[PDB]
Symmetry: C2
Subunit: 452 residues, 2 copies
C-alpha cells in the first residue's frame, strides 16, 4: 500500500497494512457504532451528508490534487470528480427518507406494508480509477439508509481512501460509521467472513469481483458488482458525425482511457466510416499528453506500471496478429506510465483483443453494413455495461434501445452515470444497480409487515 | 431421483438422471426458446399464465395427490398449495406488464427512463416441502418478465417436478420456456457454470444455497436465496391468548412442521406463560396423526427417512442435555416416517438445539420477563426469515415491528406468504425478495435509457 506518482514513477508515501487483529477491532467498533447509528433520524443523516457535500464543494482542488498525485487523472477531471461526489451526497440527503418510506399494500390486514431497515456493516471494495466518486456513489445511500461501512480501497490510492474517511468524520458521522481499511486484496476474505459484516459491494475488475461474490455467497451475504466493459459506440449514416467524433473522443480518452464506460469499440456504418475515422484520427492526434496537473493536458499517464504493461502487450499482440495501427500503439519514451491515444483498425476475426477490456486510450474501430450487423458486433463481448449509438432515425433508435445487451443505452450521447438514474451492468459487467432509488434499496432489509 | 412414499417407506418410481450432454441439450433448447420468447407480448404471456392457473384450479385434487404421495403433506394442505400456486400465476398475469412498464425520470435528456428486460435462462433449485408453490412463486414472475427457466427440483419430488413442466406446456408456453431437469445436487454446478445461464434462485437449506451462491458469484451471476428459519412466536400479556394458541399450533404444525416460516420458538411473557403453555400442550396432544390422504389427518409423516433421523437426533440430544419433554419427543412405532407433535421446555442455556432449525412439529418453549428480553431471545439465532408477535399494546407492536430481526413481522397473526407482498429472509435465511413488485424485478436487466 503506497502512493507512487504515475507522472514521475516516484514512491511518495508507504503505508502499513492493518493486521488481522486491527481489522477485527475496526469491525467491533463498526458493530457498536451501528447499534447507535441505526437509531439516528433521517434529518441527522441528511445534515451530516450535506456537511460532507459542503466539504467536497469547498475543497475540490485540494481533493482533486490527491487524486491526480496518486493515480494520474487530469487535475481538471479530478475537480469534476469531487463535484460529482458532492452531488450524489446531496441527492441522497434530499431523497433518502422518501425513498425509504413505508410502502402500503391493501390486504385483509388492518395494516400491511413494506418498511426498509439497514442491514448492519457493509463492506465496500473500491477501485483506483474514480477514487472519490465510486466511494461516494456507494457511501451516500448506504449511510442515509442507516448502515455503517468499512472501505477497502485500491492499494495505490491510500491518501484518497484516508481523505474520504476524514471528510465523513469532519462532516459529523460518528466514529465507526465509516472506516477506511488500509489492507491488501488478500485481506478482504477476513472481512467478508466476519459474522458482523452483512453485505458487500465491489467496483473494479472480474477476478476481484468473482472472489468477493464467491466468498459472500458461501456466507449467504448479498452483493452488488460493478465490473468492466467494452462499450460499443455505434455511428450510423443519419448521425451528426462532427458531434459523434468529438463526443467519441471524449468517451474514449476521458480518465486517460480508464473508465468502465469508456467508448472502447467504435462501430461505424460503411456509408460514414471513412469521414468518421479520418476525423477521429485528427482529434486523437491533437490531444495534449503530459503533466495531469497542467490545465491544458488532455492525457495524463496510466495509473500504474502494471496498467501500462497490460495495454502494451494487448496492443502488441493484436498488431502482430495483423491489426493495423492507424495511430499511436507504442508507449512514450518519457518518465511516467505514459501510453498514447491509439487507433487500431482491421482487427482480424478471432483476435484475442476483441474480447478484452482496453483500460487505456485505445480505440478499436469496425465497419458494418447494416443495423443487424452493428447489434451483433456490439453484443459480441463478455461484458455488458454501457452502449452508445448515433442515429436520428426513430426506428433505429428503438432497435438500439431494445437490442443492445447493456445496462445503459445512450442515443446521440456518451454513456454517463447520473445520481438521478440507476447505473449498473449485465453479463460479465456485474449485477445490481447504484444511484436512483435502486441505489438506496440495495442494502436494506425490505421487511414485510402485517398487522391484524 | 425417486418417489419414495413417506406414509409406507416404499419406493414407487425410480427416475434416470440426465447425462451432462442431455443437460447441455436442454440449455441449447432454452437459449433458442429464449430468443423467440423474449419477443412475445405481455398479452400472450398473460394468456398462457392464466391457462396454467385454470389447469391448477381444475385439478387441485389430482396435483395434491401427487404432492401427498411423494412428500407426505396432508391432501387438504396440498389442495391449498395448488390453489395458492394458481393465485400467484393470476397475480403476475394481471400485474406483470404494469410492474415492468418504463419508469421516466426528468433530466436534460429528451427522454430518460429505466426499462425492464429479461436476462435469459434462469436456473431454479427448489425444495420438496412446497413442491408446487415454491416453483410457481418463482416461475410466474420469471416467465411474465420474458425469461426462460430450467428447474432442478428436489430428488424426492420428481413427479411434482414433471407435473409442473407439463402444466406450463399444456397452458401453451413454448417448448424450452420451462424445462424440468431430473438431475442430482452434484450436477447443479454444470448448469450454473454454463455461459447461457444468466442467474439462479434457490429455495431450500443453507448447504445447498451456500454452494449455489458461491458458484454463481464466481461466474458473476446474480442469485436469490430463500433458506431456513427458526421463527419466534412471541406472546405478551395483552394478547388474545386463545387465538394465539390456535394460530401458533397451526404455525408450528402445518406441513407436518416442515416450513421455513413455522413458529419454532414460542416466547412467552411470564404473566401469561402457564396459561398459554397448558393450552398449547392440550392443542398438540389432541392433533390427529395418520394417513395424509385422510381429510381428518392433522399430521402426516415427515418427508424422508433422513428428515426423521435429523429431528430424532436433535431432540434426543436436547433431552440428554436436560431439556424437558412436555409432549411427544419420540418417533411413533408404525410404518412410514412419523414423528409426533412435540413440546420441549426448560432447554438449558447454550444447548445446541437453540441454534438449529427443527423441520418437524417440535415446539421449543421459553419464558421471558419483558419486551427487551423477548427481542434479544427472538433474534438470538443465525436465521432471520419471519417473526410473529402477539400484543394489543400499540407501543409494543411498534417495538416488535422495528426490532425483530426478520424479513417479515406479523402482529397478532402467523407469518404467511402472499403474492401481493414481498417475501424473503435476512441474516442466514438469505437475501432478495419473491412476490409483489420485487418478485418480477429480480431477474431483469433494469436498463437505463437516455436519448438526447
Amino acid at each position: 500500500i503506497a502512493t507512487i506518482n504515475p507522472t514521475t514513477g516516484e514512491i511518495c508515501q508507504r503505508f502499513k497494512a492493518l493486521t488481522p487483529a486491527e481489522i477485527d477491532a475496526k469491525l467491533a467498533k463498526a458493530q457498536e457504532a451501528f447499534q447507535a447509528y441505526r437509531r439516528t433520524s433521517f434529518s441527522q443523516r441528511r445534515q451530516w451528508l450535506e456537511n460532507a457535500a459542503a466539504i467536497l464543494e469547498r475543497d475540490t482542488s485540494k481533493f482533486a490534487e490527491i487524486m491526480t498525485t496518486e493515480m494520474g487523472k487530469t487535475h481538471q477531471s479530478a475537480i469534476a470528480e469531487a463535484e460529482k461526489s458532492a452531488l450524489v451526497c446531496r441527492y441522497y440527503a434530499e431523497h433518502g427518507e422518501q425513498f425509504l418510506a413505508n410502502e402500503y399494500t391493501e390486504t385483509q390486514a388492518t395494516e400491511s406494508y413494506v418498511c426498509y431497515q439497514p442491514l448492519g456493516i457493509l463492506l465496500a471494495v473500491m477501485p483506483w480509477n474514480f477514487p472519490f466518486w465510486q466511494v461516494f456513489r456507494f457511501a451516500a445511500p448506504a449511510l442515509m439508509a442507516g448502515n455503517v461501512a468499512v472501505l477497502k480501497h485500491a492499494s495505490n490510492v491510500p491518501q484518497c481512501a484516508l481523505a474520504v474517511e476524514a471528510i465523513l468524520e469532519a462532516a459529523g458521522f460518528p466514529e465507526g460509521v465509516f472506516q477506511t481499511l488500509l489492507i491488501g486484496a488478500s485481506q478482504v476474505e477476513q472481512v467478508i467472513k466476519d459474522p458482523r459484516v452483512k453485505a458487500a459491494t465491489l467496483t473494479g475488475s472480474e477476478p476481484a469481483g468473482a472472489s468477493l461474490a464467491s466468498l459472500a455467497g458461501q456466507e449467504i451475504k448479498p452483493t452488488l458488482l460493478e465490473l468492466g466493459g467494452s462499450d460499443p459506440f455505434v455511428v450510423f449514416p443519419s448521425a451528426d458525425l462532427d458531434e459523434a467524433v468529438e463526443v467519441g473522443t471524449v468517451a474514449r480518452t476521458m480518465n486517460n482511457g480508464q473508465s468502465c464506460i469508456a467508448a472502447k469499440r467504435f462501430i461505424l456504418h460503411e456509408a460514414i466510416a471513412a469521414e468518421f475515422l479520418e476525423k477521429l484520427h485528427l482529434k486523437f492526434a491533437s490531444l495534449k499528453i503530459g503533466d495531469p496537473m497542467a490545465p491544458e493536458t488532455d492525457i495524463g499517464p496510466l495509473a500504474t506500471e502494471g496498467i501500462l504493461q497490460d495495454i502494451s502487450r494487448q496492443v502488441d499482440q493484436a498488431v502482430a496478429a495483423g491489426a493495423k495501427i492507424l495511430l499511436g500503439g507504442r508507449p512514450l519514451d518519457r518518465a511516467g506510465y505514459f501510453y498514447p491515444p491509439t487507433i487500431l483498425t482491421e482487427i482480424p476475426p478471432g483476435a484475442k483483443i476483441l474480447q478484452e477490456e482496453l483500460f487505456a486510450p485505445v480505440a478499436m474501430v469496425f465497419t458494418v453494413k447494416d443495423l443487424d450487423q452493428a447489434i451483433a458486433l456490439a453484443n459480441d463481448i463478455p461484458f455488458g455495461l454501457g452502449a452508445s449509438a448515433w442515429t436520428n432515425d426513430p426506428a433505429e433508435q428503438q432497435r438500439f434501445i431494445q437490442e443492445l445487451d447493456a445496462g445503459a443505452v445512450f442515443i446521440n450521447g456518451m454513456v454517463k452515470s447520473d445520481p438521478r438514474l440507476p447505473f449498473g451492468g449485465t453479463k460479465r459487467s456485474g449485477y445490481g444497480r447504484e444511484l436512483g432509488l435502486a441505489g438506496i434499496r440495495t442494502f436494506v432489509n425490505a421487511k414485510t409487515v402485517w398487522l391484524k
